[PDB]
């Protein structure tokens, strides 16, 4: 199927009509998404099949066709852009200054932008266009609003 670098919607025909369950990144012939989007199932790209290659429920990440390729990191200072791909809507860049998730194992950047759950897997970018992580695994705060981690994998 299509292997050109870029952002892709992840769809299913299982429920009513065609439903967007998430989003992902194609880079260097490897498709990258969050685990909760596909649950590790195989994907179709036209008449081609993408098989899972690596995954981890705790990191909430999965790669198809090859190992995880994305290794850029948020510098901890600068604004970033969420390249939001919402269901039934055009891809749109939103610039924001990340907050931080503090954990017993270290700190991680977080973006406070709320989109439908089917937007999970949209990439977050730095100023050179590099993917520093994927949006869609996070928490609900007092006001009921959503805050996502900037979730990044490790390039082996």
């Amino acid at each position: 199927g299509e292997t050109t670098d870029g952002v892709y919607r992840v769809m299913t025909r299982r429920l009513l009509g065609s439903t967007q369950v998430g989003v992902g990144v194609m880079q260097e012939g490897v498709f990258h998404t969050m685990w909760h989007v596909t649950k590790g199932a195989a994907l179709r790209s036209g008449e081609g099949r993408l098989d899972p290659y690596w995954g981890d429920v705790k990191q909430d990440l999965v790669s198809y066709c090859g190992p995880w390729k994305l290794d850029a990191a948020w510098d901890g200072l600068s604004e970033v852009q969420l390249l939001a791909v919402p269901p039934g809507e055009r891809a749109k860049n939103i610039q924001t200054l990340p907050g931080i998730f503090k954990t017993k194992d270290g700190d991680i950047g977080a973006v406070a932008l709320d989109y439908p759950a089917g937007t999970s897997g949209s990439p977050i970018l730095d100023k050179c266009g590099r993917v520093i992580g994927l949006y869609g695994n996070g928490v609900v705060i007092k006001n009921g609003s959503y805050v996502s981690a900037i979730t990044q994998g490790k390039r082996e």
């Binding site: 299913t12 596909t38 705790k58 977080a110 406070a112 928490v139």
Partner: protein, 39 residues
């Protein structure tokens, strides 16, 4: 059955819409990959 469809190129947009706050939150990550707020 799940399938993928191209949605765009990955680029930084000059003068994109600028929004969102920058909260500092204490969180925990469990074995199931779920984040929870710690207070």
């Amino acid at each position: 059955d799940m399938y993928i469809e191209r949605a765009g190129d990955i680029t930084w947009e000059k003068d994109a819409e600028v929004t969102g706050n920058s909260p500092r939150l204490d969180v925990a990550l469990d074995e199931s990959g779920d984040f929870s707020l710690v207070e």
